[PDB]
Paper text:
Nck proteins are composed of three N-terminal SH3 domains and a single C-terminal SH2 domain (reviewed in Ref. 3). Nck recruitment is required for complete T cell activation, and its inhibition dampens TCR signaling by reducing Zap70 phosphorylation. The objective of the present study was to initiate development of an inhibitor of the Nck/TCR interaction, specifically by blocking binding of the first SH3 domain in Nck (Nck1-SH3.1) to the PRS in the CD3ϵ subunit of the TCR. During our studies, it became clear that Nck-SH3.1 exhibits conformational diversity and can swap half the number of its residues to form a dimer.
We thus determined crystal structures of Nck1-SH3.1 both alone and in complex with a CD3ϵ-derived peptide to delineate precisely the site of the CD3ϵ-Nck1 interaction. The apo-form of Nck1-SH3.1 (residues 4–59) was crystallized at a pH of 6.5 in triclinic space group P1 with two molecules in the asymmetric unit. The diffraction data were phased by molecular replacement using the SH3 domain of human hematopoietic cell kinase (HCK). Residues 2–57 are well-defined by electron density, whereas the remaining residues are disordered in this crystal form. As expected, the archetypical SH3 fold of a β-sheet curved into a half-barrel is conserved. When superimposed on the NMR structure of the Nck1-SH3.1 domain, the root mean square deviation (RMSD) is 1.2 Å for the core SH3 residues 5–57. The side chains interacting with CD3ϵ (black lines in Fig. 7A) are in similar conformations as in the NMR solution structure. Superposition of Nck1-SH3.1 with the crystal structure of the HCK SH3 domain (40%/68% sequence identity/homology), reveals a similar RMSD of 0.8 Å. For comparison, the two protomers of Nck1-SH3.1 in the asymmetric unit superpose with RMSD of 0.24 Å. The largest differences are in the two N-terminal residues, outside the peptide-binding region.
Author numbering: 2 to 57
């Protein structure tokens, strides 16, 4: 499993996106396009932009 941390807040605009807060711990499901699929601490999933998260 790969953990990434949110660099910035992101507000979901589409049902398949995920709301994230800066410094939130996330798990990376798919990094093969510019929408990255992530999972949060409560096992909700969705897409966030690649530039919003990084491996610490």
């Amino acid at each position: 499993e790969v953990v990434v941390v949110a660099k910035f807040d992101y507000v979901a605009q589409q049902e398949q996106e995920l709301d994230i807060k800066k410094n939130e711990r996330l798990w990376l499901l798919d990094d093969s396009k510019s929408w990255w699929r992530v999972r949060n601490s409560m096992n909700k999933t969705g897409f966030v932009p690649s530039n919003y998260v990084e491996r610490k």
